[PDB]
Structures are given as C-alpha cells and as structure tokens.
C-alpha cells in the first residue's frame, strides 16, 4: 500500500470513544506525533469494509478536512488520523465551553466548516451525513470534516436530510447545503435537536408542506435568512459552499457591521 506502517510506530495512550466497530485512541506516532487511532474490533466488520472508510481520504487533502496519516492492515486493524483534541462539535456545543460561545466565534466556526465543504464541492464529492455530531473540533475552536460518509457525485438522520435526498436518494452537494442549513441551527442553539417537539415521521411531511424552522432566539435575522436560502425546496437555487464560506467569512464586514453582544449571543 505505502500508506502502511508497523505497529511499533504507534503507542496507544488514552482511549477517546467507542462504537460497534471498535475504539478510538489518542496515541503517539514515531514517539513524536499525537494521532487518533481508529480500531477494528475483530469479527464486527470486515477489514475491507473498515479500511474502505479511509480510502477516500487518500485522495482528498485540505486544511479543514481531518487528514489521514496511515493505516495498519493486519490482524488488529488501525486507521491513523489527525488528533482533534476537543472531540465532536455537538458534544462540545452542549458542554461547559459550549455555553460561553458568542456569535462571532459561532459564525467563524461555520465559516471553517463551510471552507472545508467548499473544497469537497470543488472536488465533486458528497458528504451525505452533515451535522455537528460528524464535525471535529481541535484546540482554538478549529473545526473540521471527517471519516463518515463521502462518495463522489460521479443511513440518513431525517431532520438533517434534504427532502429530495430523503425521498429519492437524490444525495447531491445541494443536499449537503441543506444539511449545512440545519447544522447552522445546532450552532446557534447550543446544540439543540432541530425541529424540537416534532417527531421524525412528522418532520418530512411538514417540510413537504413548506414548513421551515423559525429564527432561533438571539440569532440575527440575516443569519436565519441565510438558513432559509439553504432550505430552498429547489436544489438548484440553494447557495453554493463557495458563497457560504464567503458570506460567513465576511459576516461582520458586510451583513451586520453593528453587532451587539447579546445575553446568550
């Protein structure tokens, strides 16, 4: 392969999380580098189905994509990745530090995710499962995209899934923009479940009848405005990630040059 390494390169130090597939560890690679190590619990899934999850990431490379370092294809199988010390975005939003986050940071976080998604866009891929849960956070609020979902446009959580993909499997990049729309809501509500007081089955129907989530508390109206743009029933006229990155990156130099630090935002 050449993305391959020997087990000795690696030292597994602190366990980070679990799952059906196995485990994730923080470790050192060549005694010099912090890495995250994804592990196959033997018999759960197949080495192929596992190591397939890292295929895509051999081709892609981007500052705002969680990068791939190396694999270990042997009997305890390993994928080796960059270390995002703060874990998942969603968990983070809900935590001690999640509650102290003010709008500019929240916006800039979105900008960073948008920056990565924009790259995915240039490259003709599709992420398919976009939500704070599948976003990783590093030190200093750095946010990246990860090792879940992406085929090239060559199991969905309903609430995040654009109607045409949920109904026809029309998973496109515009479908991802729609999800980015819902993602925005998580960002600005400290991680609440979108469409509160609505069950999954109900949600798709409501959305079909034109329903869209209201502007959240203390979220600017220009922001919620951007969201609805992402939620345009018509794929073709949803914004592009290039514009999203741009919009957010310039939010304060254009859309709201007079931001007043609210109580929660």
């Amino acid at each position: 392969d050449a993305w391959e390494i020997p087990r000795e390169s690696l030292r597994l130090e602190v366990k980070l999380g679990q799952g059906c597939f196995g485990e994730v560890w923080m470790g050192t690679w060549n005694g010099t580098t912090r890495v995250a190590i994804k592990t196959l619990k033997p018999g759960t899934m197949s080495p192929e189905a596992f190591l397939q999850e890292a295929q895509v990431m051999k081709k892609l490379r981007h500052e705002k994509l969680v990068q791939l370092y190396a694999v270990v294809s042997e009997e305890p199988i390993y994928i080796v990745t960059e270390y995002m010390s703060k874990g998942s975005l969603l968990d983070f939003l809900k935590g001690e530090m999640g509650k102290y986050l003010r709008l500019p940071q929240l916006v800039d976080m979105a900008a960073q995710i948008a920056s990565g998604m924009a790259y995915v866009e240039r490259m003709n891929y599709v992420h398919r499962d976009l939500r704070a849960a599948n976003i990783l956070v590093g030190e200093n609020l750095v946010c990246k995209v990860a090792d879940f979902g992406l085929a090239r446009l060559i199991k969905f959580p309903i609430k995040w899934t654009a109607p045409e993909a949920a109904l026809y499997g029309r998973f496109t990049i515009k479908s991802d923009v729609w999800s980015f729309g819902i993602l925005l809501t998580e960002l600005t509500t400290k991680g609440r479940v979108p469409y509160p007081g609505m069950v999954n089955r109900e949600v798709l129907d409501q959305v079909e009848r034109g329903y869209r989530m209201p502007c959240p508390p203390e979220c600017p109206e220009s922001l919620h405005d951007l969201m609805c743009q992402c939620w345009r029933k018509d794929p073709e006229e949803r914004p592009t990630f290039e514009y999203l990155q741009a919009f957010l990156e310039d939010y304060f130099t254009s859309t709201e040059p007079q931001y007043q630090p609210g109580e929660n935002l």
């Binding site: 073709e236 914004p239 290039e242 514009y243 130099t253 254009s254």
Partner: protein, 249 residues
C-alpha cells in the same frame, strides 16, 4: 409607447425593491417585466427615467417595452423579461460548476458593450453593480435601472460628478464581483477603511481561479488617474483579444 392595460395579464411579484415593485406578465404572448409603483404618486421621477430608456437603447440593455398609464393612477413601466434574473444571485447558486470561462466572459462582454454604447451617447449610470444586472433565458446579460460606497470611484465620492471614467471604475468592481461568483467586494476591510485604503493605492486580490488576462482588465479600470483608465471601447478590445485568443479557457 402606449399599451392597453386590458390585454395584459399580471402574473407574480418576482421583485420587492424598497425602491419599487417588479412583476411578470404576458401581453398578447410575450412574458413581460412590469415595474409597479405606488409610493404615493412619487412614481414620477421614474417617468424621467422611462424617458431616456427611449432615446437610448442597446441590445445589451433591458429593452423598455412600453408604458401603461391608466386613470386610477396605476403608474406602471413595462420592461423586457430577463428570465433568470439577478446576476448576483445566479452566480451564487450556480457557481463554477456551471459558469465556466465561456459563461463569465460572455456576461462580461454583454456589459462592456452596453457600456461602450452609453459611452458614445454621452451617458453615465453612476450605479454599476451586479445586483443591478439581469440574465435572459438564453444566457445574455442586461442592465436595468439607471442611477453605494464600495462600487463608486474615489473622485466621484468626493464630489457629485460621475464621468465615464467613474463608470469604468465601477466596471472593475463588477468584474471582480463576477469572477468571485458574487462576493461582496473588499473581503477583509472594514466599511470606513475602504475609501482611505483605496485612495492609498490598494486594489483587491485576483478573484480565485481568475485568468491573469482578466485580472489586468480589472487593475486597469482601477487606475488612480481617471484619465489613465481605459474606455468601454479599449475594454471590449481587450476582452475580445482575451476571448478570441482564448485567454479565459
């Protein structure tokens, strides 16, 4: 210039300008854009506008189709329908994956001609931005309403006079707008650092994946000396040069 209101079937409000209300129609068979104005009866200064839209016409300009003036004060302009609409919104929803060199160069020319035109008739728009451009079903770019710090030239902001060199500056901005796919200009500079920093001799960086040939056209239009910026004639020359010598692909 007259049209009989009765045979015109208004369809829907495609536009909600804080300056006017725009709508679609169909008179005898052709879809039409009808600018509806109440605003008291201050639908007046727009009649002086609707005037020069008669003694000034290009195919690159939104053709003034006619005028309906009823008794009950329904003052309404009728313009040729630009199917796709705002160039800025279009650039943003369709992006690079749809609009390649060819498409952007086309848009760019469909303007430098509608400008090369107004330049000979002794005219000046004063409000040249891509929010103000519109697009036809078959990919043609046409201007709309005759006249915003960011687009204006420096000299023009200090006075009240907008020359043909003022517009050549606003063209520069509008090009960057295009090859940015509709970014707001001056991406990392605060609202009142804009004019100072610019007068201090600053120009925006080349839009991403921008053909060098094009970025010079831009820098060209942004000369500190209005007399040293090109004309809507020299521009079309440079655009065709680029075009013909395939310097965009």
């Amino acid at each position: 210039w007259a049209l009989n209101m009765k045979e015109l079937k208004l369809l829907q409000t495609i536009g909600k300008g804080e300056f006017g209300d725009v709508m679609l129609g169909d008179y005898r068979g052709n879809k039409v854009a009808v600018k509806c104005i109440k605003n008291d009866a201050t639908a007046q200064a727009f009649l002086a506008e609707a005037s020069v839209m008669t003694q000034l016409r290009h195919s690159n300009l939104v053709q003034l189709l006619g005028v309906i003036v009823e008794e009950k004060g329904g003052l309404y302009i009728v313009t040729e329908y630009m199917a796709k609409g705002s160039l800025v919104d279009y650039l943003r929803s369709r992006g690079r994956s749809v609009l390649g060199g060819d498409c952007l160069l086309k848009f760019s020319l469909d303007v430098c001609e509608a400008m090369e035109y107004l330049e000979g008739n002794n005219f000046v728009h004063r409000d040249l931005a891509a929010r103000n451009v519109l697009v036809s079903e078959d990919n043609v770019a046409k201007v709309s309403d005759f006249g915003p710090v960011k687009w204006t030239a420096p000299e023009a902001l200090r006075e009240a006079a907008f020359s043909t060199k003022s517009d050549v500056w606003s063209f520069g901005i509008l090009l960057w707008e295009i090859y940015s796919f509709g970014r707001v200009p001056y991406p990392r500079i605060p609202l009142k650092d804009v004019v100072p920093r610019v007068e201090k001799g600053y120009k925006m960086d080349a839009p991403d994946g921008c053909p060098p040939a094009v970025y010079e056209v831009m820098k060209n239009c942004w000369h500190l000396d209005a007399a040293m910026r090109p004309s809507f004639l020299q521009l079309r020359e440079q655009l065709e040069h680029i075009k013909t010598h395939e310097l965009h692909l």
